[PDB]
């Protein structure tokens, strides 16, 4: 299977309540491995996965320095963007940053990404070719010129195709017993009469890793995606995931419906029918 | 490992 490393930064201004809230989290696939919280007592990058704990003091000192540098950059950028948008000093504002690299099963680079938001809206993003920026408005356009003058795209591309891919490969090897495991979904179907003439069929997938799964309902063989209740894939809290899909069917016509489960851990896609 | 080439907006 193909893998990703992703970092997520949230900065929220707190006017009259001291410094902005800064939260940084690192992921390999759907597993968090590092965190930083400005409001925590440590003021250190902290491990959140067992396999990162074996990184030495130099790693933790480096990631702490660099994450603090990012928090300081965000503190400045909150002030700058407040200026760009002619906003008052008494309102809370949010900067969000996401970046990361994807590698195929062979461990080779597939793609990289860098995206920035202001108050939950696109601000600036690195293009697919990793050579140029797309600015959302005139404010972001001023940023784009500053980033072009710093040759930021060259450095982002260098990171995403170099250190990002190299460290992801290292993490994948060190944590392979969890990160590179394939747990197939434990599947079952429940039946709950709504009335005398209708009933909900719910198709369950439990204890699966990674998070990527397809649950689909068919009526005699035809897909029913537009009449299917499909909850977001959710973490069980033990590192596995859960999902269900439901359809409301006429009573007596239950066996005309099939739930289809596709997961990497399955050697054969499953077809479930009420028994 | 974090990205470290930080340019202000």
């Amino acid at each position, epitope marked *: 299977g193909s893998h990703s490393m992703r970092y997520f930064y949230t900065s929220v201004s707190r006017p009259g309540r001291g410094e902005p809230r800064f939260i940084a989290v690192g992921y390999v696939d759907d597993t968090q491995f590092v965190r930083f919280d400005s409001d925590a007592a440590s003021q250190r990058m902290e491990p959140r996965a067992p396999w990162i704990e074996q990184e030495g003091p130099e790693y933790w000192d*480096q990631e702490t320095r660099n994450v603090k540098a990012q928090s*300081q*950059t965000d*503190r400045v950028d909150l002030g700058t963007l407040r200026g760009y948008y002619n906003q008052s000093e008494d309102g809370s504002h949010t900067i969000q940053i996401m970046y990361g690299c994807d590698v195929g099963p062979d461990g080779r680079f597939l793609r990289g990404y860098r995206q920035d938001a202001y108050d939950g809206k696109d601000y600036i993003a690195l293009n697919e070719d990793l050579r140029s920026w797309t600015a959302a408005d005139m404010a972001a356009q001023i940023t784009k010129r500053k980033w072009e003058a*710093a040759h930021a795209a060259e450095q982002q591309r260098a990171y995403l195709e170099g*250190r990002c891919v190299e460290w992801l490969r290292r993490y994948l090897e060190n944590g392979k017993e969890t990160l590179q495991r394939t747990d197939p979904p434990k599947t079952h179907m429940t039946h709950h009469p709504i009335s005398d003439h209708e009933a909900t069929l719910r198709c369950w997938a439990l204890g699966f890793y990674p998070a990527e799964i397809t649950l689909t309902w068919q009526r005699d063989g035809e897909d029913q995606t537009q009449d299917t209740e499909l909850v977001e894939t959710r973490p069980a809290g033990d590192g596995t995931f859960q999902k269900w899909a439901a359809v409301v069917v006429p009573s007596g016509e239950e066996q005309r419906y099939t739930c289809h489960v596709q997961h990497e851990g399955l050697p054969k896609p499953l077809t479930l029918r009420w028994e | 490992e974090l990205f*470290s*080439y*930080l340019i*202000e907006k």
Partner: T-cell receptor
Framework: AQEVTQIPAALSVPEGENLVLNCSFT??????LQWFRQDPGKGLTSLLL?????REQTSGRLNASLDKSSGRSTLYIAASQPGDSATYLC??????????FGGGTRLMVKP | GVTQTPKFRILKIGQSMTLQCTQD?????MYWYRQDPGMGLKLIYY???????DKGEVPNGYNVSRSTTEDFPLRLESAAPSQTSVYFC?????????????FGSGTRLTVVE
């Protein structure tokens, strides 16, 4: 962390002769590298500033190079003159450590 | 550019003093370094804007404040022999400082018994 080193710490050379001053740094992820001149009891003068993307910079008889793959920078001085005699400081700027200085090399160009 | 005072000062062991450092360039980033004889500059304290300060490499025995963009004073509360040094203040428009840092002329401090 960022540790900048300049070995040797002192150099003596006859005037007219070409010389190399050495700089090494442990963290190759940098904004830019700077070579300074310092006269006794005085402040800093920026001689050259090499950007992370740039491979060398030149100002007359001064030439500085950059190799991030080995984490090294050398300052070349052509046709050395007694007036070149000073302390030369190597400094590397990055996000984590900011402008970080080596111990310096005391150059004495012998007339 | 960057103005720091005084140029020179003799302190008795235990005496306090404040080194002033001012810039009118609206620079967010300000820095304090010290330099011992035959050594490089070492970062004491830095500030990324008004109302925040952060420890550098060698913060021990010093205090700083950044009430305003303009000023970054360095405080010695109790002069010790080890604080005999040359102190350089600096500023920059950005962390990357593509033009390099703007450095003050320096302050020579001599602590005596």
């Amino acid at each position: 962390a960022q540790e900048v080193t300049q070995i040797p710490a002192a150099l003596s050379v006859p005037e007219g002769e070409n010389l190399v001053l050495n700089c090494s740094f442990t963290d190759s992820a940098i904004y830019n590298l700077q070579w300074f001149r310092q006269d006794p009891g005085k402040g800093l003068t920026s001689l050259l500033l090499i950007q992370s993307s740039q491979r060398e910079q030149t100002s007359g008889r001064l030439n500085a190079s950059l190799d991030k793959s080995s984490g090294r920078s050398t300052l070349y001085i052509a046709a050395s003159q007694p007036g070149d005699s000073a302390t030369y400081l190597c400094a590397v700027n990055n996000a984590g450590n900011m402008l970080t200085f080596g111990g310096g090399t005391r150059l004495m160009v012998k007339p | 550019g960057v103005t720091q005072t005084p140029k020179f000062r003799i302190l008795k062991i235990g005496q306090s003093m404040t080194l002033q450092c001012t810039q009118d360039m609206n620079h967010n980033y300000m820095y304090w370094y010290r330099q011992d004889p035959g050594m490089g500059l070492k970062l004491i304290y830095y500030s990324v804007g008004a109302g925040i300060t952060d420890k550098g490499e060698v913060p021990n025995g010093y205090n700083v404040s950044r009430s305003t963009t303009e000023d970054f004073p360095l405080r010695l509360e109790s002069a010790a022999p080890s604080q005999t040094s040359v102190y350089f203040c600096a500023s920059s428009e950005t962390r990357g400082a593509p033009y390099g840092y703007t450095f003050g002329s320096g302050t020579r401090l001599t602590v005596v018994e």
